[PDB]
Design a protein around this motif. Structure first.
Motif, mmCIF file in Angstrom:
data_model
loop_
_atom_site.group_PDB
_atom_site.id
_atom_site.type_symbol
_atom_site.label_atom_id
_atom_site.label_comp_id
_atom_site.label_asym_id
_atom_site.label_seq_id
_atom_site.Cartn_x
_atom_site.Cartn_y
_atom_site.Cartn_z
ATOM 1 N N UNK A 111 77.718 96.715 3.052
ATOM 2 C CA UNK A 111 76.895 97.099 4.075
ATOM 3 C C UNK A 111 76.601 98.363 3.933
ATOM 4 N N UNK A 112 77.268 99.306 3.620
ATOM 5 C CA UNK A 112 77.350 100.713 3.317
ATOM 6 C C UNK A 112 76.267 100.958 2.207
ATOM 7 N N UNK A 113 76.256 100.135 1.090
ATOM 8 C CA UNK A 113 75.556 100.479 0.052
ATOM 9 C C UNK A 113 74.257 100.029 0.365
ATOM 10 N N UNK A 114 73.889 99.172 1.328
ATOM 11 C CA UNK A 114 72.862 98.508 1.690
ATOM 12 C C UNK A 114 72.372 99.599 2.870
ATOM 13 N N UNK A 115 73.031 100.206 3.461
ATOM 14 C CA UNK A 115 72.782 101.024 4.462
ATOM 15 C C UNK A 115 71.825 102.286 4.023
ATOM 16 N N UNK A 116 72.511 102.705 2.724
ATOM 17 C CA UNK A 116 71.922 103.839 1.924
ATOM 18 C C UNK A 116 70.783 103.357 1.617
ATOM 19 N N UNK A 117 70.546 102.277 1.026
ATOM 20 C CA UNK A 117 69.409 101.777 0.317
ATOM 21 C C UNK A 117 68.224 101.906 1.383
ATOM 22 N N UNK A 118 68.534 101.433 2.514
ATOM 23 C CA UNK A 118 67.582 101.106 3.742
ATOM 24 C C UNK A 118 67.285 102.478 4.039
ATOM 25 N N UNK A 119 68.124 103.565 4.132
ATOM 26 C CA UNK A 119 67.939 104.749 4.540
ATOM 27 C C UNK A 119 67.031 105.495 3.513
ATOM 28 N N UNK A 120 67.231 105.418 2.208
ATOM 29 C CA UNK A 120 66.488 105.884 1.100
ATOM 30 C C UNK A 120 64.966 105.322 1.318
ATOM 31 N N UNK A 121 64.882 103.878 1.665
ATOM 32 C CA UNK A 121 63.424 103.529 1.551
ATOM 33 C C UNK A 121 62.628 104.034 2.739
ATOM 34 N N UNK A 122 63.482 104.213 3.926
ATOM 35 C CA UNK A 122 62.953 105.047 4.993
ATOM 36 C C UNK A 122 62.573 106.265 4.812
ATOM 37 N N UNK A 123 63.409 106.937 4.107
ATOM 38 C CA UNK A 123 63.303 108.331 3.734
ATOM 39 C C UNK A 123 61.870 108.405 2.850
ATOM 40 N N UNK A 124 61.780 107.651 1.897
ATOM 41 C CA UNK A 124 60.443 107.583 1.066
ATOM 42 C C UNK A 124 59.295 107.345 1.777
ATOM 43 N N UNK A 125 59.481 106.278 2.784
ATOM 44 C CA UNK A 125 58.107 105.999 3.352
ATOM 45 C C UNK A 125 57.965 107.041 4.408
ATOM 46 N N UNK A 126 58.738 107.768 4.892
ATOM 47 C CA UNK A 126 58.352 108.730 5.785
ATOM 48 C C UNK A 126 57.548 109.843 5.469
ATOM 49 N N UNK A 127 58.298 110.197 4.244
ATOM 50 C CA UNK A 127 57.547 111.152 3.341
ATOM 51 C C UNK A 127 56.051 110.959 2.721
ATOM 52 N N UNK A 128 55.937 109.651 2.326
ATOM 53 C CA UNK A 128 54.807 109.146 2.181
ATOM 54 C C UNK A 128 53.836 109.326 3.321
ATOM 55 N N UNK A 129 54.327 108.838 4.342
ATOM 56 C CA UNK A 129 53.686 108.908 5.602
ATOM 57 C C UNK A 129 53.041 110.176 5.840
ATOM 58 N N UNK A 130 53.990 111.224 5.833
ATOM 59 C CA UNK A 130 53.699 112.441 6.236
ATOM 60 C C UNK A 130 52.540 112.996 5.146
ATOM 61 N N UNK A 131 52.452 112.645 3.966
ATOM 62 C CA UNK A 131 51.507 113.173 2.860
ATOM 63 C C UNK A 131 50.063 112.370 3.532
ATOM 64 N N UNK A 132 50.352 111.226 4.094
ATOM 65 C CA UNK A 132 49.172 110.391 4.430
ATOM 66 C C UNK A 132 48.636 110.980 5.636
ATOM 67 N N UNK A 133 49.084 112.149 6.351
ATOM 68 C CA UNK A 133 48.374 112.672 7.401
ATOM 69 C C UNK A 133 47.023 112.825 6.984
ATOM 70 N N UNK A 134 46.637 113.257 5.811
ATOM 71 C CA UNK A 134 45.314 113.152 5.368
ATOM 72 C C UNK A 134 44.728 111.881 4.923
ATOM 73 N N UNK A 135 44.910 110.727 5.677
ATOM 74 C CA UNK A 135 43.898 109.606 5.262
ATOM 75 C C UNK A 135 42.784 109.428 6.155
ATOM 76 N N UNK A 136 42.339 110.346 7.194
ATOM 77 C CA UNK A 136 41.185 109.882 7.873
ATOM 78 C C UNK A 136 40.593 111.003 8.057
ATOM 79 N N UNK A 137 40.876 111.781 9.335
ATOM 80 C CA UNK A 137 40.221 112.932 9.973
ATOM 81 C C UNK A 137 38.875 112.825 10.526
ATOM 82 N N UNK A 138 37.788 112.263 9.749
ATOM 83 C CA UNK A 138 36.571 111.678 10.333
ATOM 84 C C UNK A 138 35.887 110.649 9.598
#
Lengths: 35, 35
Positions: A8-35
């Motif tokens: 469970x801890x191993x998977x917890x870490x994995x889930x957290x890492x996935x979330x971290x990556x997705x949030x970072x991607x999402x932050x980069x993705x702030x510039x997907x629309x604007x207009x």
């Protein structure tokens, strides 16, 4: 807490890492629309 | 302090939920973004 927590801890870490990556991607993705 | 193994489970569920927000959040925009 000799086995279940281990996986469970191993998977917890994995889930957290996935979330971290997705949030970072999402932050980069702030510039997907604007207009 | 079972809020080890079951807190951990609850957190894992919480994070799976968070991943599943975030993955749709990352997928959307793509439909008009890609242009």
């Amino acid at each position: 807490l000799s086995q279940a927590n281990v996986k469970l801890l191993a998977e917890n870490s994995s889930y957290l890492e996935k979330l971290r990556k997705t949030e970072e991607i999402l932050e980069e993705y702030e510039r997907r629309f604007q207009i």
